[PDB]
Design an enzyme around this catalytic site. Structure first.
Site: not given
Lengths: 459, 450, 450, 459
Positions: A155, A276, A282, A289
């Protein structure tokens, strides 16, 4: 028409024509189409439809055609519909006469399918290799990093400490099933459909066994109607890919999660991430993805092929033409994703410290209970005891591992001096010695087990 | 506030997983048996559990079992009744066990049974078809491409085309069944069994082909569910084509077959209009089965490690799809064994224009290249056209006008029985090829049952 | 032989379509009412029918209705009980009517009710969200791209992003509801009503927005079912994202929100581990809903005109998907109104490095082109890096080392509250933009209920 | 890595790179990307980020870039990732200075989406036209052929005579719903997302209303996070296409069936069929089969986009990149299929005779019953009577329309002399006068009704 409006283009209609062409993509079948034509040629020969000279005439010409393809020298025709017409149009400009004898008794129906299966047999081969490579990589890193520890989740809540290697092996094991499924699909692909004609079979009695040996297939199709209309081998492949993408999408989700500031357990190499400009910390997981997004691309093609096959009447139908692009697109996607995934797990860095810091004493609350169960106490009893233990430290406003051995004994007399072993996250994972568990020895067992599966699959 | 009625009902599963009652006890009994070998139970405590667990099965069998309003799932109901049956000794059963590895064991056990039953039904349907083919291999009707009459073929060749596709379905089922037959028990909640229970013992007791390699995978993967749902989907695809074909052949227009009154519905004022109800139902299930398959893959997509509530969505899909296949296979078997072909209408659909091509093969067979032969056939076609008579009505002399090779043989070409016999190369529609096919599927089928 | 038990059970539908009992009588009553205007019934015969039909509803209401073993569907059961209730006058009801146009009328009537209820639930969930946004618009937490901390934003801006998506779902539902509200009755079996019954009367009696244009389409199309299933699918997509977001925020790692005990499950030995059960269930239904949608389109694909048994597959999909949406919307509404945000942890997640960009906007805002400003920010970044201190800890003098424009203003940049307020252009996260958003969805929502 | 095998390509990896490029297809957005950049330019101006000279500097340059595209003069860069980089790389080689000010406050996230919606707004426009054209055509032919009769089917069994026009109007009516759905989708597409920045919105306060007016959108997005991450407009479109393809697949199935020797009601023009060399009577419905096969292609893309969107976390993610190719492919497919369908129904020939010959007396058995119901007899009674009638002729071994008026009266005294009207298939269809029925007057009603819908949709 004419009593009403509409589309009266004439006796051709360019829309219907380009929407009918397939050369734009089936052009990749040129390798196997040629190869498949050389074998039919030798078939006709033995059957006595052409002479040892006509065969060599045709056979040789075909090699010249192939060569032009391999050089980019091949001049295609807008006057060409498909790669099938293209190859025998050229084979006609280099032989003219006999050239128009190669297609004797052969239909485009059993010809095209032979090309697709021949082509796939080859593509599925490399896919098998790329996949074994991903598994071997994961397995090897699992062995190297067997002593790193981080949390296991349910979970998406921290549950208990586990071996990072165990997590790796969890995805490797699923992929070996994908590997096993591909092998089964590969067999059903390696069946020779050539010699089925257009629907009733080959009319001139050419040898099906010969053709089978030439092209080195594993067997021949049992029925001409099935052989020219079925596409199970394509649907099967698409599902295999879809289910494999499911697993990869899951590994992507995990890794994407693990590289968030919030978790900070893993970090991707610059090769597979995007940073970035004004923010050096970042690091976007583009690669991961991307992989995740491809699961829908793939599954959708599978879903699409199934709806196309549903309800079609016997035997051959134009609807079957939708198979080629589906296979091609998914084949490229799977090759890219598998290699990209191999590069990711291969070059990603872990932060052993951050991973160790996510482990907390409150996870051991249950280990405290297991300690008592080995002492003879029933589980309910131990669970209740460890519950009291939990409640104690809470009121005292301290951590579960800061309760004195004396404090523990006010709970139960069974708590001895060795109880301090429970406070070690290392000791915790070593409890799972049963095969398949997260204990170090078990992980060795897993690694050997997978190593062997890979081996048995190499045969 | 503290409890929401929808949330509970929403979370409830006893409604459907109650079907897992029998496999659930088997799993528990075997677990306890391996639980005492680890020292967690006394030979005496085990007997209590085993004996009392049988008491629980008993009630389910007689339908005397009383579900409780507080019962969340089948796993809970069986353990509640076990407690109030033999005391607190029952609360020792679950030690070291989790629902995560218990539920998946039941599902696999349940599926291992059902899939064995499906393989059975499927083999019978294939068997029924091959048998019929053998018996009617003399029958001839048209073959189609683009639903446009192509050439004559054997009705048995048609049956065999479908039989062979189903044979692959049978093979895929067997591979799926092998992967279903793996024991997940002793995998705990996520990291494995902490109390050192022997998993090979559990495997032996429950008759599993093997045990799971990784605890995290064993309690979260649902590949065996996905595979199974896809297997059913591709199999439905095959039945939908067969159904489409038969519905077509049942039309007044084709009038090739007639279903018995058991799988068709009639009209009161029209005794000649019989609806292929059965066939239409079979074709409609293709989508239903596929939808579950589709829905399940979308559910598995993107879930993080390890166990998540989303997995609770497997059971209903398995139950629904299993029931559907069971009925669809039997129905299909029923229509195939009782349908009735109309031989005269099948032969009546054969035409001489279908024989144009044969004249070409006739020429190549005795000399000229295919190209010339085809062009020579086109002339024979055009000729009989301008004279207003079928190719069959073309005199030997006239054909000789096209080419000298048109010997006396040519007359045999006009016989459909000769047309079909041209395809002897293995897999063709010639009678000897059909015998071969019947023997192959028969052999193939025998191999799958060993 | 003459009857196959599986074929019957397979063909049975009373099991589920029994839910159409109430809308079924409405349809029949209205039909009979239009049946006598055509002269097929006597004002006396109608009363019998109407009165007796109410008797039938009554039994269903009390649950005293006794289904028959011979009952195929709900349509049959209601007509069997009507007969044995008022005699053969009942057998005059169906004249000129067919099951084809009767079943579809019931389904539409049933759906018209349910969809009204769904619109209600959905509006409440959207309403609940906007209200919460209004109340917590001071809260600030991080915004993400690639699940990588990007910049500070308002927690209300987050709620509104989802609220707005659901608002589109609401709009799509209303368009679907308009197309559901069309009367198919008086379309017969395929060619229409043969006894000249007035369809505008039927439409008026049953309160339909319009009547069907073509009888063949009215009894075979299932667009309204497909649309509805897709609507639910896209809506589930939205809830799955929201659920994913909240599950993420509930993790120990993010620790931004906490669900109440009603929509979460705890651990006995770990009082700090609460599972997002509710959220996981919501996300798992996305696939279930989509599967039906997928399965239904595959069923409609390739069917020939006109009516075919395959259409019998609509009802179960509608029932299952409707129940799922009802529960999922309520649950979602429940979690949203009772969840608890942890403000300190949300602000604690904000960092000064997120402000690097703001320094750039600061420069462009007072002079230099963006390009220069960005490069100027990179220097401020690198500088504080080599000195081991956050941008926030960089002195005015030092910044001036990069550019002279770094006036005293620069200090305001270091305030997250200032960062967010930079986005006042309509739709941004600045507080005034949020007020605007709240007023827009509120207005938009009011328009949909008129 | 290095302690194990794997894929160590370096700091780039060409697989990850091409698998990341989109210029290969997003290149079509060049028209709207330029257009969308001109509008943002004017936005920055009013906002005071550039001068009336800088705007004209940039604005003008953009037009020069567009021109190069329209001439094929545009030289693309392998050094180019996407059409966005390409356009502003050129806009930089023609202006250099100011060029690097256009993207101020703008992100690729809200830029790309503006391009997609802008592009679709345009593509959906032509689709609307192509569809209205198919409907208008079907409707017009329906009016012209209102007096042809053929059978209506259920369970694919001959049921009763109907008007061929009614059958046509049955598909036209479904398509107008597809037409209505497209219009609704078009509204939700016409919403301006530009000005949402990367996630939090536009930071420099540019006017959103201005941008909206420039690009002529219908409204502006309410929330920046939604505007940059949602793709409802793409999913919605894909479903619209899928459901439309469902209808077309049905019309294809019918027509394919109707042109079989078995039915022989229709025949396709050579423009949309393929004949056999040695068989002049064999006319394959390639066109129709093609259409039918495309329903799966389309539905699959829809299914694929939905699985990609499922479970994605806020806000923007790389997974969203899968939208472009999906829209493009389906858009082309829908344009081709709609035009091909317009040409088919526009030029297909019918065989009135064969259609009339498929009608048989046994279909009138039920009309015989309706005859009695108008005479006052209850339906059960009439149905039973017509049943006896059926049984009679059967034993007599003749057709239902060959029973004498006297023979009929031995069934019921109500059978009068006008009963011979029942034996006319023409009389049969005229019974369905209720709106929506197959009676001629009803068909006129339908034609007017659809004509009006089309009109209201033109607005």
């Amino acid at each position: 028409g004419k009593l009403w409006g509409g589309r009266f283009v004439g006796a051709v209609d360019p829309i219907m024509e380009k929407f009918n062409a397939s050369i734009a993509y089936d052009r990749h079948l040129w390798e196997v189409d040629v190869q498949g034509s050389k074998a039919y040629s030798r078939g006709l020969e033995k059957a006595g439809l052409l002479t040892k000279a006509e065969m060599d005439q045709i056979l040789h010409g075909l090699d010249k055609v192939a060569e032009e393809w391999a050089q980019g020298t091949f001049k295609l025709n807008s006057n060409d519909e498909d790669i099938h017409t293209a190859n025998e149009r050229r084979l006609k400009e280099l032989i003219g006469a006999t050239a128009g004898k190669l297609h004797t008794g052969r239909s485009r129906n059993d010809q095209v399918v032979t090309d697709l299966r021949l082509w796939m047999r080859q593509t599925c081969s490399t896919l098998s290799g790329l996949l074994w490579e991903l598994i071997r990589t994961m397995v090897d890193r699992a062995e190297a990093e067997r002593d790193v520890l981080f949390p296991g989740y349910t979970h998406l809540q921290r549950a208990q400490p586990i071996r990072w290697s165990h997590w790796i092996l969890s995805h490797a094991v699923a992929l070996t099933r994908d590997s096993e499924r591909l092998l089964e699909v590969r067999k059903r692909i390696n069946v020779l459909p050539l010699g089925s004609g257009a629907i009733a079979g080959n009319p001139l009695g050419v040898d099906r066994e010969l053709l089978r040996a030439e092209l080195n297939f594993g067997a021949i199709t049992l029925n001409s109607m099935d052989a020219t209309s079925e596409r199970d081998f394509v649907a099967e492949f698409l599902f295999w890919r879809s289910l494999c993408m499911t697993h990869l999408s899951r590994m992507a989700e995990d890794l994407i999660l693990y590289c968030t500031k919030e978790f900070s357990f893993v970090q991707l190499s610059d090769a597979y991430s995007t940073g970035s400009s004004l923010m050096p910390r970042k690091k976007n997981p583009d690669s991961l993805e991307l992989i995740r997004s491809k699961a829908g691309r793939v599954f959708g093609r599978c879903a699409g092929l199934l709806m196309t096959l549903k309800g079609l009447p016997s035997t051959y139908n134009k609807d079957l033409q939708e198979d080629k692009e589906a296979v091609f697109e998914v084949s490229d996607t799977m090759s890219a994703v598998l290699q990209v995934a191999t590069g990711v797990i291969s070059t990603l860095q872990i932060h052993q410290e951050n991973m160790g810091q996510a482990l907390s004493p409150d996870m051991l609350a249950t280990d405290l209970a297991y300690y008592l169960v080995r002492k003879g106490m029933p589980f309910r009893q131990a669970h209740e005891a460890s519950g009291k233990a939990v409640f104690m430290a809470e009121t005292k406003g301290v951590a579960l591992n800061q309760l004195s051995l004396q404090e523990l004994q006010t709970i139960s007399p069974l708590f001895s001096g060795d109880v301090i072993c429970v406070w070690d996250y290392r000791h915790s994972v070593e409890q799972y010695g049963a095969l398949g568990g997260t204990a170090r020895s078990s992980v060795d067992w897993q690694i050997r087990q997978v190593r062997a599966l890979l081996q048995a699959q190499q045969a």
